[PDB]
Amino acid sequence: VNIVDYSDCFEGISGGAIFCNTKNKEYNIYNKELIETRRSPCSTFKIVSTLIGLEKGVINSKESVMGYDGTDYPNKNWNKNLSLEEAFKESCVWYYKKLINKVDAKSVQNILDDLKYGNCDISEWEGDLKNGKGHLNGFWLESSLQISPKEQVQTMAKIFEGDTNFKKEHINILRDIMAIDVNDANINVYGKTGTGFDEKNKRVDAWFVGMLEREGDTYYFAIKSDDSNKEITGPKVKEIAINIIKKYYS
Numbered sequence: 079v080n081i082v083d084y085s086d087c088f089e090g091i092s093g094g095a096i097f098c099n100t101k102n103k104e105y106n107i108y109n110k111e112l113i114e115t116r117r118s119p120c121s122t123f124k125i126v127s128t129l130i131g132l133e134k135g136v137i138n139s140k141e142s143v144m145g146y147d148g149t150d151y152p153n154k155n156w157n158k159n160l161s162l163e164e165a166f167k168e169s170c171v172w173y174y175k176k177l178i179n180k181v182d183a184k185s186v187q188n189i190l191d192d193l194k195y196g197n198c199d200i201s202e203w204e205g206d207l208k209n210g211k212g213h214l215n216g217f218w219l220e221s222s223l224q225i226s227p228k229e230q231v232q233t234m235a236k237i238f239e240g241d242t243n244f245k246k247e248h249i250n251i252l253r254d255i256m257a258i259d260v261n262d263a264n265i266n267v268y269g270k271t272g273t274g275f276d277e278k279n280k281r282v283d284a285w286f287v288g289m290l291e292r293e294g295d296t297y298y299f300a301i302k303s304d305d306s307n308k309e310i311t312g313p314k315v316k317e318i319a320i321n322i323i324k325k326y327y328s
């Protein structure tokens with residue numbers, strides 16, 4: 079366990095980072111207090127909800143659809159019968175809400191318990207209805223479910239090292255749709271962003287969670303901001319993460 083200083087990559091934004099290589103148990107931690115603090119996963123939960131949907135047969139492949147009903151949305155790309163791969167990349171809320179509402183709560187509870195997914199608290203299934211967004215809400219979006227960045231990395235590692243009961247076929251689908259292009263062919267990066275605002279504490283929850291493969295070694299990582307500036311989003315934290323990866327993990 080090495081405590082490290084990634085502050086220059088954060089360019090003044092409050093946050094922390096954790097990178098873990100489970101082969102040689104090398105844990106690299108920037109801002110330990112934050113890395114151990116549980117927060118809503120927001121859209122990073124789509125990593126797990128994709129696997130839940132595949133395991134339960136709600137979806138079956140990166141092509142699978144959820145029966146778009148014509149509802150109007152401001153994001154152009156939500157207004158179509160999009161595939162799993164597209165819904166993941168566009169973070170399409172209606173697709174993932176419809177997916178998860180086909181699964182019984184006991185099944186979700188037991189999968190989260192098996193994964194040790196933070197507090198595993200799905201008590202507020204409907205989500206944070208006081209924000210007015212109605213059915214665009216759920217337990218994983220600034221609501222009952224909370225997970226720390228360290229726990230995110232532990233979950234990512236358990237999934238992608240083959241240590242869960244999820245089918246290998248399904249984990250490979252998730253790998254495919256999480257892959258990102260960082261304009262460096264010598265590292266394979268995979269991940270997912272998330273963005274929320276913590277009304278109680280007046281701070282963002284901005285995430286980039288995933289893994290890095292670099293010639294033999296694999297690092298599971300979570301980058302998290304808790305800045306008070308509402309301009310700090312998941313995509314901004316992904317930029318910070320990529321800067322860290324290129325500086326220290328190339």
Ligand SMILES: *C(=O)N1C[C@H](NOS(=O)(=O)O)CC[C@H]1C(N)=O
Nearest residue numbers: 120121169219271272273312313
């Ligand atoms: C998930 O965090 N969300 C869904 C969507 N994607 O956000 S992301 O670009 O950070 O991945 C919009 C924000 C958020 C939400 N409001 O539900």
